[PDB]
């Protein structure tokens, strides 16, 4: 097994305030395949200046997906206090064929800081975190969201400059507010921008450390890191699984400005992923440092036949979901 660094030496966890009503917003960003939203590129052949019909894993036209939002935590003028999160940890979803994720879409626009609805701020991109596995159930106090045996965790870190992917048994810790302790509400991750995101010295383990407060990582078969360049550009992330393992997709490395997703990793996870949840993150800012963080959107994948329009340079800038209606069907034919 892999050394993933020391266990947390903390005797308690940070208290977590779950307030789902603050995260219930209607900010629709439905799939528009005309603009090639949510498209994993059919890698393997050379396509250029051509229109084809292709059956693969796609989200459906007009799917609103599931929206998730991360918020600044409670704070006084000087001191971060309780984390502030939605009820995401108890909402375990079926993995099925996997999913794609629209990330950072609202970046640059003006939006509410969530925990203080009357306060607006410029929206910044934030990366999603996921917990995935083969077996789920409840924690000791009865709350849902516990993943058993080896669990895949995808956790961004370093103020959005890396992604960590690791596959470990998650042993719930027993201090106050921890998942095997008293006064448990939800687990979460956090970082503390004042100390973790100072210029030139980003803390590349902040979120991982926060996670290690709620769970001891045991028998990790791997822990990989992927560096990310800092920007506010819209991006797409995807995840699927085959007998070869778990496949991660991103628009970042191959189509940063266009959004087409290409595979960047295959993780040696051969036990079938059946379940996932979104890991809530809360940003331990002080009141005067509060920002708004871009909602992200998760859309389930399914086998569908699309018309794909490949440009001269090889990218897909237009698609049709053939089964959407008879008109689309006709156009595909
Ligand atoms: C920060 O996280 C990294 C993982 O990204 C930890 O890296 C491990 O560090 C130990 C030494 O402490 C090495 O023996 C392992 O080989 C490292 N693992 C990997 C996957 O790189 C690191 O320990 C963490 N740092 C702190 C201070 O906790
Ligand atoms: C937010 O604004 C930034 C800055 O203008 C945008 O970043 C640019 O994105 C375009 C592609 O859309 C690139 O060609 C530029 O090189 C980027 N500039 C920098 C300085 O990174 C960003 O796209 C905007 N985000 C959203 C969601 O609109």
Radius of gyration: 20 Å
> Which kinds of small molecule does this entry bind, naming each only once?
a molecule of 2 linked components (NAG-NAG)
Structural class: mainly beta
Major sheet: order of its strands? 3-23-7-17-18-19
Tally of discrete structural domains: 1
Number of beta-strand segments:
25
Taken from the alpha-carbon principal axes, the silhouette is: globular
- The SSE order reads EEEEEEEEEEEEEEEHHEEEEEEEEEEH
User: What is the percentage of strand-forming residues?
Assistant: 35-45%
- The number of distinct helices, counting runs of at least 4 residues, comes to 3
Could you give the distance between the termini? Answer: 52 Å
Give a quick account of the main beta sheet: strands, pairing sense, barrel closure.
Answer: 6 strands, antiparallel
The percentage helix is under 10%
Domain BetaCoV S1-NTD: 1-333
Subcellular location: Virion membrane; Host endoplasmic reticulum-Golgi intermediate compartment membrane; Host cell membrane
Family: Belongs to the betacoronaviruses spike protein family.
Subunit structure: Homotrimer; each monomer consists of a S1 and a S2 subunit. The resulting peplomers protrude from the virus surface as spikes.
């Amino acid at each position: 097994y892999v050394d993933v660094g020391p266990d947390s030496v903390k005797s308690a966890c940070i208290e977590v305030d779950i307030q789902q009503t603050f995260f219930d917003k209607t900010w629709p960003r439905p799939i528009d395949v005309s603009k090639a939203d949510g498209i994993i590129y059919p890698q393997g052949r050379t396509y250029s200046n051509i229109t084809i019909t292709y059956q693969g894993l796609f989200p459906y036209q007009g799917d609103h997906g599931d929206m998730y939002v991360y918020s600044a935590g409670h704070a006084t003028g000087t001191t971060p206090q309780k984390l502030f999160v939605a009820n995401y940890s108890q909402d375990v979803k079926q993995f099925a064929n996997g999913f794609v994720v629209r990330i950072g879409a609202a970046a640059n626009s003006t939006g509410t800081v969530i925990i203080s609805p009357s306060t607006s701020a410029t929206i910044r991109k934030i990366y999603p975190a996921f917990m995935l596995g083969s077996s789920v159930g409840n924690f000791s106090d009865g709350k849902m969201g516990r993943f058993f045996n080896h669990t895949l965790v995808l956790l961004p870190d370093g103020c959005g400059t890396l992604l960590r992917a690791f596959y470990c048994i998650l042993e719930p810790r027993s201090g106050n507010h921890c998942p095997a302790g008293n006064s448990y509400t939800s687990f979460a991750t956090y970082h503390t921008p004042a100390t973790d995101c100072s210029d030139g010295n980003y803390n590349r383990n902040a979120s991982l450390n926060s996670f290690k407060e709620y769970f001891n990582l045991r028998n990790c078969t791997f822990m990989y890191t992927y560096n990310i360049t800092e920007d506010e550009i819209l991006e797409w992330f995807g995840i699927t699984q085959t007998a070869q393992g778990v496949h991660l997709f991103s628009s970042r490395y191959v189509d940063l400005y266009g959004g087409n997703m290409f595979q960047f990793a295959t993780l040696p996870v051969y036990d079938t992923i059946k379940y996932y949840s979104i890991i809530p993150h809360s940003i331990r800012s002080i009141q005067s440092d509060r920002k708004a963080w871009a909602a992200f959107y998760v859309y389930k994948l399914q086998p569908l036949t699309f018309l794909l329009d490949f440009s001269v340079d090889g990218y897909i800038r237009r698609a049709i979901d053939c089964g959407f209606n008879d008109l689309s069907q006709l156009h595909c034919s």
